[PDB]
């Protein structure tokens with residue numbers, strides 16, 4: 429059962445649920461760490477969509493303003 | 509607006525979360541792979557106890573400190589997550 433799995437340490441290496449279709453933000457933050465122009469580049473990808481970085485499924489454009497895209501980019505890159 | 513708020517209200521939440529996947533497969537995915545597969549309980553109980561590699565990737569599951577009875581109970585529980 430679930431309680432036995434927890435006690436035995438199984439959940440250190442296993443999630444109950446599958447990953448979402450896009451990359452986890454902590455992974456995005458780590459990928460861009462120490463990269464020039466990360467903030468601006470990520471804001472553009474959030475607004476305009478992106479592909480070929482993490483897998484075969486593209487991210488479509490998002491209906492966000494320039495300011496919203498920058499806010500979100502900075503927040504993503506800060507996830508430590 | 510706060511990014512946490514935008515993250516939810518602009519649809520990002522449909523496709524993204526904060527935390528990365530753990531090293532082994534998600535139990536929901538194990539359940540899906542082995543549903544209706546003959547001998548799934550005994551197969552998985554064996555892997556849980558003995559450890560193994562190569563089915564989901566090259567990262568191994570170490571042998572686990574469980575009794576045979578616990579390994580079977582854990583396999584049965586995982587197979588129910590669907």
Ligand code: HEC
Nearest residue numbers: 450478479480481482483485486487490500518519520523
């Ligand atoms: C709502 C506004 C958001 C925000 C803030 C982000 N996304 Fe997505 N995203 C999705 C997929 C499949 C990818 C990977 C595409 C590929 O393989 O190239 C992404 C990528 C991102 C990133 C990382 C960009 C990079 O180049 O590293 C970031 C920061 C990001 N997203 C933020 C999928 C989806 C969705 C599926 C339908 C939706 C909706 C969104 N993303 C929305 C957002």
Ligand code: HEC
Nearest residue numbers: 436438441532555560561562563564565567568569572582
């Ligand atoms: C605690 C007792 C548990 C339980 C109940 C399970 N695990 Fe793991 N596990 C890990 C890795 C890397 C894998 C993939 C191995 C491969 O690619 O072949 C697995 C796999 C499983 C399965 C599926 C086995 C299969 O052949 O399909 C199951 C049912 C499972 N585990 C249950 C990694 C780890 C850990 C990392 C250190 C730890 C701890 C555990 N697992 C513990 C458990």
